Design a protein around this ligand. Structure first.
Ligand SMILES: Cn1c(=O)c2c(ncn2C)n(C)c1=O
Length: 330
């Protein structure tokens, strides 16, 4: 089997991407944030505290003839951005882009933190990291991909995120028309439950490539590119007037600037992030200070190849017995 679904930016900055997901019978379609940095499929629901729902589409398990309470199971998750959610669990039929999993754990939110409430466009998350990170207790649950894997034509999914445009998540096949050149594969460590890999270096603009190992995670659920402070400083030093602002919470730059590209290494291959991908616009409406798309990972504890990096590539998440990651230009 295979599946193919379009993923769409939630706003003009590509802050996140939403992908329609069919849950239950008859189908309830919710727009979920596919997150390769976590492993819970959770949704706004009929159980979510009413004051914490503001425009989201909810899953109502009592209206699904295939929903079953997973008795005694609870979940609770906190994300790198400080947001969180928790609740109980149903199993139900879940389909993405024509690919159907029966008995998928659908984690129903009883509580969500303010950032979720305030984002009316995201109806929940669909985790695509390794199932060892799933938070369901006392019986850990499998991700949608892990449940689908054996049925797939090939045990893979791909992320093809757009810049200010829709893109695609495919399951079970590699669309050879969706990228240019060849795909370069690189080793993954699953020791922390992430799609963790080691970039071979970077360049800033037309500058020379610096060979250096940068361990990080491929994370579709993180907006920006978070790298060591040394690398980030080298990038922003090439933008007149750029500076790190503790009050704003990272590097800002004059909105009048033209940003240089940023290149990252994948083995001997190179992925180029155009400068425009690094512009996240005014820090507040009407401001001439703009927020940067490359930020320091110091204090996070891990480097994160988020959407800014991933949307410059066609990315293969290879879930074979020994997982690997593939990157191609497009
Ligand atoms: C602080 N900040 C962000 O954290 C941010 C942003 N755009 C995207 N992000 C993530 N802007 C404009 C911003 O000012």
């Amino acid at each position: 089997s295979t599946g193919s679904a379009t993923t769409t930016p939630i706003d003009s900055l590509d802050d996140a991407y939403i992908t329609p997901v069919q849950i239950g019978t008859p189908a309830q379609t919710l727009n979920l944030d596919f997150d390769t940095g976590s492993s819970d499929l959770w949704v706004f629901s009929s159980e979510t505290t009413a004051s914490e729902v503001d425009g989201q589409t909810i899953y109502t398990p009592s209206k699904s003839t295939t929903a079953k309470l997973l008795s005694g199971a609870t979940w609770s998750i906190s994300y790198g951005d400080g947001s969180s959610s928790s609740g109980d669990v149903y199993t139900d039929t879940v389909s993405v882009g024509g690919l159907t999993v029966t008995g998928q754990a659908v984690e129903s939110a009883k509580k969500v933190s303010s950032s979720f409430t305030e984002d009316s466009t995201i109806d929940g998350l669909l985790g695509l990291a390794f199932s060892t990170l799933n938070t369901v207790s006392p019986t850990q649950q499998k991700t949608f991909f892990d449940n689908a894997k054996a049925s797939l034509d090939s045990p893979v999914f791909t992320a093809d995120l757009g810049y200010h445009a829709p893109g695609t998540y495919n399951f079970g096949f590699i669309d050879t028309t969706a990228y240019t050149g060849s795909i370069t594969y690189t080793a993954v460590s699953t020791k922390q439950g992430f799609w963790e890999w080691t970039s071979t270096g970077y360049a800033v603009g037309s500058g020379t490539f610096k060979s250096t190992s940068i361990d990080g995670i491929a994370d579709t659920g993180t907006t920006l590119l978070y790298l060591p402070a040394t690398v980030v400083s080298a990038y922003w030093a090439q933008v007149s007037g750029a500076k790190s602002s503790s009050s704003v919470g990272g590097y800002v730059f004059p909105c009048s600037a033209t940003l240089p590209s940023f290149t990252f290494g994948v083995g001997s291959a190179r992925i180029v992030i155009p400068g425009d991908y690094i512009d996240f616009g005014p820090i507040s409406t009407g401001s001439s200070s703009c927020f940067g798309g490359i930020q320091s990972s110091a204090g996070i504890g891990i480097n994160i190849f988020g959407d800014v990096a991933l949307k410059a590539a066609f990315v293969v998440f290879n879930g074979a017995t020994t997982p690997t990651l593939g990157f191609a230009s497009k």
